[PDB]
Amino acid sequence: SMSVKKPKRDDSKDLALCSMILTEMETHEDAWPFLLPVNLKLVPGYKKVIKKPMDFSTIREKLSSGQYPNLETFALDVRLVFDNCETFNEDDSDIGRAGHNMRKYFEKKWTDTFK
């Protein structure tokens, strides 16, 4: 409350650490469905169904240009990429499996880097 603060958690490295995580996601072999925005002209249904499209390149640009206020807003966009993927793709598809693999990969790096 006013003039009553919890001890200040050091957030000075968060930008660099989220960048490193994102590099590792970018270079994973199963990243390929996620590297670029889904082409809304060429993928029937995507535009209407997926209200907030997100992809690694778009997160990378947001990150590089100070559009994440804190590390939680960064994790929300990463999770959105996987949530969108589950919304649109069957679990038993290459892309569906890719999404589950990447989300697992991300959540471990997240916990190990910050928790």
UniProtKB/Swiss-Prot annotation:
Protein name as catalogued:
Bromodomain adjacent to zinc finger domain protein 2B
Q: Where does the source fall among the domains of life?
A: Eukaryota
| Tissue spec | Expressed at varying levels in several tissues, whereas a smaller transcript was expressed specifically in testis.
The Swiss-Prot or TrEMBL record describes its family as follows: Belongs to the WAL family.
UniProt-annotated location(s): Nucleus
This chain is encoded by the gene named BAZ2B
Q: How does it assemble?
A: Component of the BRF-1 ISWI chromatin remodeling complex, at least composed of SMARCA1 and BAZ2B, which regulates the spacing of histone octamers on the DNA template to facilitate access to DNA. Within the BRF-1 ISWI chromatin remodeling complex interacts with SMARCA1; the interaction is direct. Component of the BRF-5 ISWI chromatin remodeling complex, at least composed of SMARCA5/SNF2H and BAZ2B, which regulates the spacing of histone octamers on the DNA template to facilitate access to DNA.
According to its UniProt entry, the function of this protein is described as: Regulatory subunit of the ATP-dependent BRF-1 and BRF-5 ISWI chromatin remodeling complexes, which form ordered nucleosome arrays on chromatin and facilitate access to DNA during DNA-templated processes such as DNA replication, transcription, and repair. Both complexes regulate the spacing of nucleosomes along the chromatin and have the ability to slide mononucleosomes to the center of a DNA template. The BRF-1 ISWI chromatin remodeling complex has a lower ATP hydrolysis rate than the BRF-5 ISWI chromatin remodeling complex.
Q: Which residues form the Bromo domain?
A: 9-113
Range within the parent protein? 2054 to 2166 of 2168
